Amino acid sequence: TPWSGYLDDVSAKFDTGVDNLQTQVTEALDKLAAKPSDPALLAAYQSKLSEYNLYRNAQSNTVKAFKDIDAAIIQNFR
Amino acid sequence: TPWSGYLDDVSAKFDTGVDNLQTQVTEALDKLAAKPSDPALLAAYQSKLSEYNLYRNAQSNTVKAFKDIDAAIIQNFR
Amino acid sequence: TPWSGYLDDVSAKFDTGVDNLQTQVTEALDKLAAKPSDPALLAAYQSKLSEYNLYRNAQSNTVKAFKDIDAAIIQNFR
Amino acid sequence: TPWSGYLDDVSAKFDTGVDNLQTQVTEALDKLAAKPSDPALLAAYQSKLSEYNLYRNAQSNTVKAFKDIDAAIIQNFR
Amino acid sequence: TPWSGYLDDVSAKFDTGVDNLQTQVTEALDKLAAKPSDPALLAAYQSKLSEYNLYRNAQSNTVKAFKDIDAAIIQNFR
Amino acid sequence: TPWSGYLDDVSAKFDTGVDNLQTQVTEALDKLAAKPSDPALLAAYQSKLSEYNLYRNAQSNTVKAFKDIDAAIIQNFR
Amino acid sequence: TPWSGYLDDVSAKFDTGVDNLQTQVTEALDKLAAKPSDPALLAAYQSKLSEYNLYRNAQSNTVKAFKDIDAAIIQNFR
Amino acid sequence: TPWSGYLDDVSAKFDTGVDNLQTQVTEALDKLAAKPSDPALLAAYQSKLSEYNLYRNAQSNTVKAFKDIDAAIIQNFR
Amino acid sequence: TPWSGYLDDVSAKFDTGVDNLQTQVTEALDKLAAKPSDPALLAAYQSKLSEYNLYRNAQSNTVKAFKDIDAAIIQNFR
Amino acid sequence: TPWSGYLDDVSAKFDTGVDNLQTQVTEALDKLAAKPSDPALLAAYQSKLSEYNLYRNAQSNTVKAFKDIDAAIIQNFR
Amino acid sequence: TPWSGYLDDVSAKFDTGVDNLQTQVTEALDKLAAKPSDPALLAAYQSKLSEYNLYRNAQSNTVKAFKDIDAAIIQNFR
Amino acid sequence: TPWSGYLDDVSAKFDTGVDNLQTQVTEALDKLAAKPSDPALLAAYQSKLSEYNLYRNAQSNTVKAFKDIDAAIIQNFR
Amino acid sequence: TPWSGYLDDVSAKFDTGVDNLQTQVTEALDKLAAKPSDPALLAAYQSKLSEYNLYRNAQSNTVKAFKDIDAAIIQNFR
Amino acid sequence: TPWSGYLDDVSAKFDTGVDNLQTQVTEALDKLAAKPSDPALLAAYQSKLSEYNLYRNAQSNTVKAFKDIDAAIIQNFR
Amino acid sequence: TPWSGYLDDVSAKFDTGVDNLQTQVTEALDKLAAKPSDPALLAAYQSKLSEYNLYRNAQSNTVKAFKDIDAAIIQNFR
Amino acid sequence: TPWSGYLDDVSAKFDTGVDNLQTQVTEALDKLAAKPSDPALLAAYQSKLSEYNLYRNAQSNTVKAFKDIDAAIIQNFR
Amino acid sequence: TPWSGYLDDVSAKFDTGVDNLQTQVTEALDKLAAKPSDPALLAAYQSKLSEYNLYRNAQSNTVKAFKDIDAAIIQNFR
Amino acid sequence: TPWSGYLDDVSAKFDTGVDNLQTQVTEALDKLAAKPSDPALLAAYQSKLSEYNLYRNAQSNTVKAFKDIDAAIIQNFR
C-alpha cells in the first residue's frame, strides 16, 4: 500500500467521489471526436467537460486551502 | 484522565467552542466530493472551510501567544 | 442544534434573505424543461437564474470578504 | 467601570471614532440579504464593507504597533 | 493573612493595577472560542491578549529588576 | 447624522453628482413598461439605462480603487 | 512650526513633489461625478487616480523602507 | 531505592506533576510523523511540544535557581 | 551502524513515518515532466508536492524545537 | 523641582528633542479614527507612528546603553 | 536624634542626594501598574528604575569600600 | 561538465521530459508565420503554444516550490 | 581635527567607500518625488534605496561586531 | 600512551559516546556543499549540525562544571 | 598561500562545492539582460538565481552556526 | 564617475543589455499617438510595450532578489 | 593645581587620549534627539556611543587593575 | 629586541599562528566598504570577521587563563 497523507486523502475524496468522470470525459471525447456535429454528443460532452472543470478546480483549491492551514500551524512550532 | 497543561486547555477551548466543525467540514467535503457542481454544496463548503481556516489559525496563534508569555517569565527564574 | 460561526451566519443571512429562491429556480427549471419554447417560461427562468447568479456571487464574495478581515486580525496575534 | 489599558484606549479610539459602523455594516447586510440585486443596496454595502475592512485593519495594526513599542521598553528593564 | 515580601508587593501592584485583566482575557477567549470568525470578537481578543502580554512581561521584568538590586546589596554584607 | 467614511464620501459624490438618475431610470422604465414599442420611450430608456450602467461602474471601480490605496498604506503600519 | 522627523521629511518630499495631486484627483472626481459618461472626464480621472495610486504607494513604501533601516541601527545600540 | 537529593526532588516534582507529557509528546510525534498534514494532528502536536518546551525550561531554571541558593550558603561555611 | 542522536531520531521518525514520499514526489515529477498537461498528473503532483512541503517543514521545525529545548538545559550546566 | 539623574536627562533629551510628537501621534490617531479611509490621514499617521516607534526605541536603547556603562563602573568600586 | 556613624553619613549622602527617587520609583510603578501599556509610562519607569538600580549599587559599593578602608586601619591597632 | 544543483535538476527534468517542445513551438511558429490562415497550421500552433505555456509554468512553479522548501530548512540552521 | 576611534574609522570606511550614496539616494528621491510614475526613476530609486539599506546594515553590524570583540578583551583586564 | 586527566576522560566520554559525529557532520557538509538545494541533504545536515552543536556545548559545559568543583576543593588545601 | 581558518574552510567547501555557480549566475544574467523575454533564458536564470540564493544562505548560516559553537567553547576558557 | 554598487551594476546590466528600448518605446509611442489606428504602429507598439514591461519586471525582481541574498548575509555579522 | 595620584594620571590618560569624546557623544545625542530617524545621525551616534562604552570600560578596568597591583604591594609592608 | 614574558609569548602564538588575519580582515573590509552589496564580498567578510572574533577571544581568554594560574602560585610565596 502506497503512503497517503491528509492532502492525498482530501484529493482522493474528490477522486472517489466522482466515480468514473475521468473515464466519462475521455469516453465522451472519443465519441465526439468521431463525429463532432451530433448535438447529442456535443451537449453530452459540454456537460461532461464542464463537470470535469469544476471537479479539478474544487480538488485543487481544497488541497491548496488545507495546505495553507497546515503551513500556518507549522510556522508556530518555532 | 490524560494530562493537560495550560496551552492544552487554551487549545481545547477552541476545540470545544466549535462543536463539530471538524466533523462539519469533513461532512461538507464528503457531500461536495460526490457532486462538485451543486452551488448549494459549494457555498456550504466555502462557508465551512473558511470557518475552519479561521478556527485553526486563531487556535494556533493563541497557543503561540501564551507560549511567548510563559517563556519570558521562565527566563526570569535565573 | 449544529454549530454556526460568523461566516456561517453571514452566508445564512443570504440563505434566509431569499425565501425559496433555491426552490423557485429549481421549479422554474422544471417547468421550462417540460416546454422550452414558452416565452413566459423562458422569461421567468431568465429572471430566476439571473437572480440566483447574483445571489450566489454576493454570498460567496461576502464570506470571502469577512474571511480576509478575520485572517488579518489573527495574523496580529503573534 | 471595567479596566482599560493603553492598548484598550487606542483600540477604543477606533471604536468611538467610527460612530455606528459596526451597526451600519450589519444594517446594510440585512437590507442587502433581503434583496441582493438592488444596485443601490450593493453599492451601499460595498462602501460599508470596504470601510469596515479598513477600520478593522487599522485598528489591529495599531494595537500591534504599540505592543511592539512597549515590549521593547520592557525588555530593557532587566 | 499570608506573608508577602517586597517582590510580592511589586508583583501585586501589577495584579491589582489591572482590575480583572486575568478575567477579561479568559472571558474574551471564551467568547472567541465559541465563534472564531466575528471581527468584533477577534479585535477584542487581540486588544486583550496583547494587553495581557505586556502586563505579564512588565510584571516579570520588574520583579527581576528589584531582585537584581537586592542581591547586589546582600553581596556587600560579607 | 449617520457616519460616513472616505469611501462613503467618494461613493456619495457619484450619488449627488447625478441628481435623480436613480429616479429617472426608474421613471423611464415605468413609462416604457406601459408601452414598450414607442421609439421615443425606447431611445429615452436606452440613454438612461446606459447612463446608469456607466454611473454604477464608475462608482464601484472608484471605491475599489481607493480601497486598494488604503489597504497598501495600512499594510505598512506593522 | 510643528515638529517633523526624517520620515516626515521623506513623506513630505512626496507631498510637495506632487503639487496639487491631492486637489487634482478631488477636482477630477467632482467633474466626473457630475457627468460619469464623458470620455474626456473618464480618461482624465483614469490618469489622475492611477497617478495618485502610484504616489501613495511610493510614499508609503519609502517611509516603511527607511523605518526598516532605522530600526536595524537602533537594535545595535544595546 | 536510588538516592535523590533536594534538586532531584525539585526536578521530580516537575516529572510527576506532568503525568505522561514525556509520553504524550512522543505519541503525538508518532501520530504526526505518519501523516504530517492533518490539522488536528498538527494543532495537537503544537500544543504538546509547546507544553513540553515550557516544562523543560521551568524544570531546568528551577534546579539552577536552587543550586544558586545552595552554593551561596555553602560559600559561608568557611 | 551509524550513530544517531535524539535529533536524528526525531528527524527519522518523519523519514520513516512517510513511507516513500521522497520517492513518490520524485516519481510524480518524472511522470509530470514527460507530459505537463495531463490534469490527472498535475493534480497528483500538486497533492504530492504540497504533502512534501508540509513534511519538510514539520521535520525542520521539530528538530529546531528540540534543539532549543536542549540548548537551554545545557546553558544551566555552568 | 523634581529630581532627575543622568538617565533622566538623556531620556528627556529625546522628550524635548521631539517637540510634540507624543501629541502629534495622538492627534493623528484621533483624526484617523474618525475616518480610517482617507489616504491623506493614513499616510500622515503612518509617518507619525513610524516616527514614534523610532523615537521610543532610540530613547529606550540609549538609557539602557548608559545604564550598562554605569553599572560596569560601579562594579569596580569594590 | 538617632546616632549615625561615618558609613551612615556616606549612605545618607546618597539618600539626600537623590531627592525623592525612592518616591518617584514608587509613584512611577503605581502609574505603570494601572496601565502597563502606555509607552510614556513605560519609558518613564525605565528611566526611573534604571536610575534607582544605579543609585542602590553606588550606595552599597561605597559603604563597602569605606568599610574595607576602616577594617584595614583597625587591624593595625594590635 | 557544468555544475547543476537540485533546482537545476528539477528544471531539467522538465527540459528533457518534453523532447523538442522548444523546437516544435519554434517550428510551428515558422510554418504559421509563412501562412497565418491555414486552419491546420493554426490548430497545430494552438496545441503547441498552449502546451508550451503549461510546460513553462509547471517548470517555474516547481523550482519556486522547492526553493521555498529549502529556504525554510536553511532558516533553521541558526 | 575631531577625534575618531577605531569604531569611528570602521564606520567611516563605509562612509568613504560609498562615494556620495547619501547624496545619490537623496537626489534619486527628489527626482522621484517630482514624478513618482516614471519607470526609469522608480527603477533608479529602487537600486539606490536597496543599495543604501545594505550600506547602513553592513555599517551598523560591523561597528557592533568590533564592539563585541573589544568588550570581551576589556572584560579580561580585571 | 598519552596522559589523560579526569577532565580529559570526561571530555572523551563525549568523544567516544558519539561514534563518528565529527565525521558525519564533515561528510554531511561535503554532500551538501556539492548540491546545497537538495531537501534531503539540507534536512540531513540540519539534524547533524544541530546534533553537533549540542554535543560540543554539553562537552564544554561539563568540563567547565567539574573544573569548578575541583578548583573549590584545591582552594581548601591551604 | 593566504591563511584560512576553520570558518574559511567551511565557507570554501561551499565555494568549491559549487563549481562555477558564481560564474553561471553572472553568465545567465548577461544572456538574460540582452534579451529579457526569452522563456528559455528566464527559466534558466530562475533556476540559477534560486540556486545561488540557497547557496549563499546555506554558506552564511553554516559559518554562523560554527561560530556559535566556537564562541561557547572559548567562553569556558576562563 | 558616480558611485555604483552591486545592485547598481545588476540594474545596469539590464539597462545596457537593452540598447535603446527606453528610446524605442518612447519613439513608438510618439508615432502611435500621432495616428492611433495604423495596425503597423499598434502592433509595433504592442511588441515594444510588452518588451518594456518584461524588461522592467526582470530588472526589478533581480535587484530585489540580490538584496534578499545580501540582507541575509549581513544579518549573520552579529 | 589639584592633586592627582597615579590612578588619577592613568584615568586622565584616557580622558586626554580621547579628545572631546565626552563632547562628541553629547553633541551626537543632541543632534539625534532632535530627529531620531535620520540614518546618518543614528549611525553616527551608534559609532559614538559604542566608542564611549569602550572608553569608559577600558578606563574603569585599568584603574581597577592598577589598584589591585598596589593593594598587594601595600599588604606586604607589614 | 623588546622584552616578552610568558603571557606575551602565549599572546604572540596566536599572533603568529594566524598569518595575516589582521591584514585579511582589514583588506576584506576595504573591499566590502567600496561595494557593500556584492555577495562574494559579504560572504568573504563574514568568514573573516567571524574568524577574527574567535581569534581575539581565544587570545584574550588564554592570557587571562594563564594569568589566573600564575597569580595563584605567587599567592603561595608568602
Author numbering:
A (entry chain A), B (entry chain F), C (entry chain Q), D (entry chain E), E (entry chain K), F (entry chain R), ...: 3 to 80
The publication says:
Salmonella enterica serovar Typhimurium (S. Typhimurium), a gram-negative bacterium responsible for innumerable cases of acute gastroenteritis worldwide, utilizes two T3SSs, encoded within its pathogenicity islands 1 (SPI-1) and 2 (SPI-2), to invade cells and establish an intracellular replicative niche. The core component of this machine is the envelope-associated needle complex, which consists of a multiring base, an inner rod, and a needle filament extension that protrudes several nanometers from the bacterial surface. The entire structure is traversed by an approximately 2-nm channel that serves as a conduit for the T3SS protein substrates as they pass through the bacterial envelope. Furthermore, four residues at the end of the C-terminal α-helix, three charged (K66, D70, and R80) and one polar uncharged (Q77), form the lumen of the channel and create an electrostatic surface potential of alternating charges, which spiral upwardly about the needle, a feature that has been proposed to be important for substrate translocation.
Since we observed no differences between the structures of in vivo and in vitro polymerized needle filaments, we solved the cryo-EM structures of PrgIS49A and PrgIV67A filaments assembled in vitro from purified mutant proteins. These mutants are located within the C-terminal α-helix and resulted in specific phenotypes, such as constitutive secretion (PrgIS49A) or deficiency in the secretion of SipB (PrgIV67A). The 3D reconstruction of needle filaments assembled with PrgIV67A fell into a single class average involving more than 99% of the particles. The 3D reconstruction after 2D classification generated a map with an overall resolution of 2.9 Å. Although the helical rise is the same, PrgIV67A filaments have a smaller twist than wild type (63.27° versus 63.35°). However, no significant difference among PrgIWT, PrgIS49A, and PrgIV67A was detected in the structures of the monomers extracted from the assembled filaments, with a Cα RMSD over 77 residues of 0.152 Å between PrgIWT and PrgIS49A and 0.225 Å between PrgIWT and PrgIV67A. However, the predicted electrostatic potential of the lumens of filaments assembled with the PrgIS49A and PrgIV67A mutants showed significant differences with wild type. To clarify this issue, we fitted PrgIV67A monomer into the map of PrgIWT filaments and found that the resulting lumen electrostatic potential was essentially the same as that of the PrgIV67A filaments. These results argue that differences in helicity itself may not account for the observed differences in the electrostatic potential of the lumen surface. Rather, it suggests that slight differences in side-chain configuration may be ultimately responsible for the observed differences in the electrostatic pattern of the lumen.
